[PDB]
UniProtKB/Swiss-Prot annotation:
Domain topic, free-text comment: The N-terminal region mediates dimerization and homooligomerization. Both the helicase ATP-binding domain and the helicase C-terminal domain form intramolecular interactions with the HRDC domain in a ATP-dependent manner. The HRDC domain is required for single-stranded DNA (ssDNA) and DNA Holliday junction binding.
Protein name (Swiss-Prot/TrEMBL): RecQ-like DNA helicase BLM
UniProt region (3' overhang DNA-binding), positions on chain: 37-39, 48-52, 87-93
Signal peptide range: none
Function: ATP-dependent DNA helicase that unwinds double-stranded (ds)DNA in a 3'-5' direction. Participates in DNA replication and repair. Involved in 5'-end resection of DNA during double-strand break (DSB) repair: unwinds DNA and recruits DNA2 which mediates the cleavage of 5'-ssDNA. Stimulates DNA 4-way junction branch migration and DNA Holliday junction dissolution. Binds single-stranded DNA (ssDNA), forked duplex DNA and Holliday junction DNA. Unwinds G-quadruplex DNA; unwinding occurs in the 3'-5' direction and requires a 3' single-stranded end of at least 7 nucleotides.
Record family assignment: Belongs to the helicase family. RecQ subfamily.
Localization terms from the record: Nucleus
Disease connection: Bloom syndrome: An autosomal recessive disorder. It is characterized by proportionate pre- and postnatal growth deficiency, sun-sensitive telangiectatic hypo- and hyperpigmented skin, predisposition to malignancy, and chromosomal instability.
Species whose genome carries this gene: Homo sapiens (Human)
Length: 121
């Protein structure tokens, strides 16, 4: 139904912005600890105030129900636009963090439009 392309473009650009220290010579990489769980991304997107980061795509999702914002991310993973590997902290917990998938660069080149079906409940 609703076209969610410009949002995916920026969600993608965002995710990758918080992956390296672009600029400084040593293009240092972030994560696994400096990576976002799908919820942290949903919280950031949905302008939540528990958002770890409150810039970039911080206010974007203000027109999405929390339910739908989640499904939009569940989908972006499903579509390999965003992917998630696992992290294991010292307390021996397995945490799933999000990263870009082989299809993200596509959406960035407009070569791929994304569509989303808004759901209730």
């Amino acid at each position: 139904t609703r076209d969610v392309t410009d949002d995916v473009k920026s969600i993608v650009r965002f995710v990758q912005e918080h992956s390296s220290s672009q600029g400084m010579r040593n293009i240092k990489h972030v994560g696994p600890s400096g990576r976002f769980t799908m919820n942290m991304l949903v919280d950031i997107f949905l302008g939540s105030k528990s958002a770890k980061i409150q810039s970039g795509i911080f206010g974007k999702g203000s027109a999405y129900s929390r339910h739908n914002a989640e499904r939009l991310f569940k989908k972006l993973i499903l579509d390999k636009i965003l992917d998630e590997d696992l992290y294991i902290n010292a307390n021996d917990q397995a945490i799933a963090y999000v990263m870009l998938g082989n299809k993200a660069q596509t959406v960035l080149n407009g070569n791929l439009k994304v569509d989303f079906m808004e759901t209730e409940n």
